[PDB]
Please model this.
Amino acid sequence: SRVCQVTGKRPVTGNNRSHALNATKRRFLPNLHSHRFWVESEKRFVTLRVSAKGMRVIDKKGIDTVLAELRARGEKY
Amino acid sequence: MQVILLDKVANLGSLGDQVNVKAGYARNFLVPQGKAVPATKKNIEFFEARRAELEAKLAEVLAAANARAEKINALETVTIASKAGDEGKLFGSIGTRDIADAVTAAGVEVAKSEVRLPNGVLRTTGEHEVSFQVHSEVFAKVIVNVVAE
Amino acid sequence: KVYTIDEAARTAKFDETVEVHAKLGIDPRRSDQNVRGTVSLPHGLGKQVRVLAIAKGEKIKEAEEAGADYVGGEEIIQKILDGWMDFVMGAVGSKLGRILGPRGLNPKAGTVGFNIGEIIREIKAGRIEFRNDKTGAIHAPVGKASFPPEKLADNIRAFIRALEAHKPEGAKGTFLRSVYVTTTMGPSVR
Amino acid sequence: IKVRENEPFDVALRRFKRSCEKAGVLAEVRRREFYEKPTTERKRAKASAVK
Amino acid sequence: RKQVSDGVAHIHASFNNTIVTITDRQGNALGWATAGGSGFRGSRKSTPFAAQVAAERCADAVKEYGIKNLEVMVKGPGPGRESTIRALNAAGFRITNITDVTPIPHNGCRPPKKRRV
RNA sequence: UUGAGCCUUGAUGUGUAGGAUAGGUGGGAGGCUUUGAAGUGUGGACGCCAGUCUGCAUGGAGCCGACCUUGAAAUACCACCCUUUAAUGUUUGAUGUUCUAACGUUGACCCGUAAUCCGGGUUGCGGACAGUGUCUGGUGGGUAGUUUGACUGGGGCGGUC
RNA sequence: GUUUAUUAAAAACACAGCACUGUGCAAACACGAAAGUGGACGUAUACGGUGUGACGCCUGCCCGGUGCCGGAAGGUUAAU
Ligand SMILES: [Mg+2]
Ligand SMILES: [Mg+2]
Ligand SMILES: [Mg+2]
Ligand SMILES: [Mg+2]
Ligand SMILES: [Mg+2]
Ligand SMILES: [Mg+2]
Ligand SMILES: [Mg+2]
Ligand SMILES: [Mg+2]
Ligand SMILES: [Mg+2]
Model:
C-alpha cells in the first residue's frame, strides 16, 4: 500500500479548490520509491518502500537506527 | 550533506576532511563503499580525538627516530680489530652487520640494516666513513677506524 | 578606491581637462536631464570667466567686476547683429525675453544673474566657478573639474558634484561616476 | 578534356574542347528526347554527304 | 584565418548563369561568387562580362587564404565558360592545368521535352 | 559547447553653401610619433564592392586651429557613449560528450522449489534518462452539477421591460 | 444473414470489398487508483479506430471556416 515504512506517510484526502472555489475530493499521495540500502552491519541490501522524506530520515538517524525501529514494531524487512 | 571522508577520494576528498557532498553521491556510492561517512557531530569529534593523537604525538617520536643520531656524532668513532697485509691494508673488512653489529654492541643501538657502507670502510685499513640510517631524511655520519691489532 | 582617486590624473600641459561624466537614468515614463543656473561646486576652481550679458548702458560700472570682463550694451544688441564671424552668457529674468537677438539659426546661454538693485552686491557668489552640462545623446553630465594644481582638495566635486543626483523617472538607474581626460581614463563607484 | 600546360605562356590553348564534348553532345543531350526523328535527321545528314 | 596557396578553381557555367567556387586540393570550399549575385539580373547575368566580374569578386575572397597557384575545372556550356578563366589569370593567379568536367550521360535519363517557342 | 543578461576593451557615420564619406553634446588654442610616423605593397576582414581599420612590413621625420563659409568645426588630442557590430571572462542554465552506483528491464541464468507467481543472487542491455510524488500552464461533453427571465387576448415568432 | 421478446422485419443493422487513419511490440487500444489482464502465446501480408458497402463504369473543383498534422524566428505566457 502506498505507505512509507519509515514515517508512516500514506495518502491523505483533501479538496481541489477551483478558481470559482468549487471543492472536489482528491488525494495527496506520498513520494514513495522503493530503494536498496546497503546495510554494512548485515552484509546485505535491504530494499525499503520509502518516501523521500524517509530517505532524509535514514540519512540522519542512520539506517541501522531506522531498521531497528521497524524491527521494534514487528515491521518486516 | 557534509559527511567526513575516509580514503583520499578524487576531485574533492583528502583522507579525513569535512567536505560537503550531494546526497545522491553519499548514499549509493561513497559511504556504502566506505569512502566517507555522515557528519553526525557525534562523529566530527570522534575525529577531534583523531586530530590530536597520532600526529602531534608520534612525530616527536620520529624526533626520537632522529635524535638517535644525536648520539651518532657525539662518539663518531668505533674501531674494528682488523689487521693489515703487506702494507697497512686490511687483513679484515667491515660491512653493515659489522658496522651495525659493531655499533649496536655498545651505547649506539641501531637496526642492522641501518648502516650504509659504500663499497668501502672495509677494503683497506685505517679511518673510513659510513651513512647511518634511522629516518628517511635524517641519517648521520660517523667515522670508522679498522684497528690492525 | 572607495571614494575617488584624485591622484589618478598622474603629459599634456595641465590636467584641468578631467570631465565629470556621472551617468544618469533613461527616459522611462517622463523625466529630463537639466543643469541649474551655472553649477558652481564648493571649490573656487580659480576660473576668471568671460560673462557676456544682455544688460544696458548703465551697468558697465560694476556689473563687470564680479567674475567676468565685459558687458554688451543697449546699442550693441542689433548694431553688432550682421555677421556670423564678428558675432557663461546671461539673460535677466522676470519679464525680459531673449528671442530678438539670441534665438535664430545654436549655442548654450541662459543663466547668469538677474539684478536691479546691485550689479555686484556684497554676497552673491557662484558664477566664476563652473559652467553647465545638459542633455546630449543618451545621457548628460558633460562638464569639467579640478586641475593639475589639486589633490584630494578638488575631490569636493565628488561629494558635492555626484550629490547633484536629481529625481529620476521609473525603471531607471542613475549612478556611474567617470572623470579624467588629456592623459588617461576611468573612476570607481558612486 | 585535360590540359596540363607547362612553363612560358598564359594563353588558354584549349582548342581541345571543340574537338570532343562541349555543345557537341551538350546542345544535343540538352532538350527533347528525339526518337524516330533522328532517323529522319540522320537521313538528311547523308543525302547531303553524298555531294 | 588558415593558409593553403595550392588551390582549385571550380566554375559552373550554364546558359542561365555561371557560378565560381575556389576550393582547396581536397575539394573543401574556400570562396565563391556568382554572376547573378554581382548585380545584373536576367539577360544581364547571362553574359561573359558578368562571369568575369564573378571570377573577380571571387579572387577578392579566396586570396583570403593566400592562394598562389590553382587548377581549373570547367563545367557546362554557356558564356563565362572561358571568359571567367581569363579573369583568373589576370587577377594574379598562377594557373596550373585546365580541364573540362561537363557531365556526359551514356544515355541515361530522358531529358525534358518541350520548347515550342 | 552554446542562447541571454552584465563588466572592461576596439569599431564606425557618402542632409546642402565647403580646404571633405561633419554621430550628439563637453574639456579644448597644442597633443603627438624616435615608447621608431605619414604613404606606398600585401596579409585577416566588415560590406548599400562606396571604402575604410589594422598586427606585420617597404618605410625614415612633421601634420595643424577661429581659419571666410555651415542651423552645429575638426582625423588637433580625449571622454561618458548613441547607430550597430565584434572578441576573452563572470555568472545562469540549456543543449551536446562519457562513466556507473541510484533507478528501469515484459533478455539469459542460479537458488529457495519437481513453481511461466514472487523473493534473493549472478550476468547482459539500459541508465541518471525513463518513470513516479508535489506544484504548475495547456488540453479536456469523456464524466459531472447546473443555468438557459418575465409580459403576451393560449404558447411561439415579432415587440416590450 | 440481423433487428425493435409484447403495435415497425424494413429501404434500417451486418456483410464480403474499398479507403483513410493510428500502431516497432512493455504496440496502439481497452478492463483496471494498482497489481494483474485482454490485444496475442499475434509482430505491419499484423493489430486498433473511422467512414464506405458485391460487382461494372467512375469518383471533378474548394484548405476561407471548423477539425487534424508540421514549423519555429519573433510576440505573449505558469509555478518558481
Ligand atoms: Mg459523451
Ligand atoms: Mg452535461
Ligand atoms: Mg409566460
Ligand atoms: Mg432475408
Ligand atoms: Mg414488435
Ligand atoms: Mg420484456
Ligand atoms: Mg410484425
Ligand atoms: Mg483494419
Ligand atoms: Mg450506408
